[PDB]
A paper describes a structure:
Microbial epoxide hydrolases, cis-epoxysuccinate hydrolases (CESHs), have been utilized for commercial production of enantiomerically pure L(+)- and D(−)-tartaric acids for decades. Studies have shown that both RhCESH[L] and KlCESH[L] adopt a two-step catalytic reaction mechanism by 18O-labeling studies.
Two molecules are present in a crystal asymmetric unit, and gel filtration experiments showed that both enzymes form homodimers in solution. In RhCESH[L], the key residues involved in hydrophilic interactions include R124, R145, Q150, and D152, while L128, F137, V141, L159, and L176 participate in hydrophobic interactions. However, sulfate ions, from the crystallizing solutions, were observed in the catalytic pockets of RhCESH[L] after the co-crystallization with CES. The residues involved in sulfate ion binding, including D18N, Q20, T133, N134, K164, and Y192 from the core domain, as well as R55 and R59 from the cap domain, formed a polar substrate binding pocket that was well-suited for binding small, highly hydrophilic molecules.
Residue numbers in the entry:
A (entry chain A), B (entry chain B): 11 to 247
The structure:
Amino acid sequence: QFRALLFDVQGTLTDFRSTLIEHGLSILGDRVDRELWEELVDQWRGCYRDELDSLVKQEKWRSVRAVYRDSLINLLAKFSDSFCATSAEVELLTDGWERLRSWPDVPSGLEQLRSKYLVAALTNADFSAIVNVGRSAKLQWDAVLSAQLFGAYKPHRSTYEGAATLLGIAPSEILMVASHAYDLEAAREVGAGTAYVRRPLEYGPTGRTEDVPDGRFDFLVDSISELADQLGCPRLG
Amino acid sequence: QFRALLFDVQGTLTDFRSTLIEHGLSILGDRVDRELWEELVDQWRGCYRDELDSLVKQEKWRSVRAVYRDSLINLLAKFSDSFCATSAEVELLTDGWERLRSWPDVPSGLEQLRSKYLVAALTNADFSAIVNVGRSAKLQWDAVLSAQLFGAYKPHRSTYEGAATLLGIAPSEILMVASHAYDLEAAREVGAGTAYVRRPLEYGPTGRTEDVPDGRFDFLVDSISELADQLGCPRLG
């Protein structure tokens, strides 16, 4: 049925929240309290989402590193009374988004899938960032794809379709894999299969994630290994 | 000194000649003699080269799969007194260029290199072709880059510079690895380092060799593992 599996990375395969909390607290130390920082991280992601949403609607693309950097700068102003940072520290903090760690099932799951399928990333993050995340999150791919290559972010159709063209396959031959429903709904619009991965801790132990019922998407799993098992991929030794 | 290595793939890492000889004989069987099929493969590589040379001069890009397919159709007409092939066999033979096997040093050389460097493919072949060749040749990349992403073949500057900016890396921090002098001299012009890999059997025992003496390029080696050793990579037991 499918020839390739295309993956969202931030959240779906990576624990961004934990990564940035600890990264930040290591750059900043006692200048900041964990609870303020965690709240900042939560707002930083929100800012990212809002800016991308605006950009998508305006049919524009910009460096995601810049999006992240500029949102941190704005947030630092909001929180100026509590702590401060240098421009050099801004660059270091922003780097955390390129040092994402993976959820425990990811490396092995992805490897299991490769017995039967090509695996590729389709990310909104810039090409350089995904290459970097490969090392921090231990992801091995057949291909790496980014919005930067198409000049458009997901959910735009061009992304998914462009990936297909690049991979020499029809969109119907792609299974999109994501823990964000908007991504899967846009993939289904171009004919792809959809696989939702539940990440209950994506937004922290007290966070609220999307509740997805059985039947909305083709697959509904709690780990990439589980998805590989449901697609009939043999197990690793 | 370097953050990443960018590699030519066909010939540099892959024994395309042996691949397409055994692949064609596997498909055509006894309908063609081995020595005739070998001469066809050499002319087929020659047609690809002349065609790309022509397109580079015209600032044009076209699918490399269609380049191999059309030139094979032409060669079949010239050899049509001797053997024949169906339209389905044309497509199966052309697939040979997406099933390239690697030289024996290559899979473990690439692995040793990854301990200190990012490694990426920069190929004239279509994106899907290099993705398929990763399975047949056993190549694992941090990134795969193709002339198809840039609309231009190597040696155009825009391919190396495009690779550099997508990776977010200064060209002076990229080492280009190739067994073809034209490729390394082109990379040198954009500021990259150069590593020449001698492949005495690329065009078979009686082939057109360009001799490179020492000092023409930054590195001159006989295997990717030797290159890894010269870059100070630990050997992996």
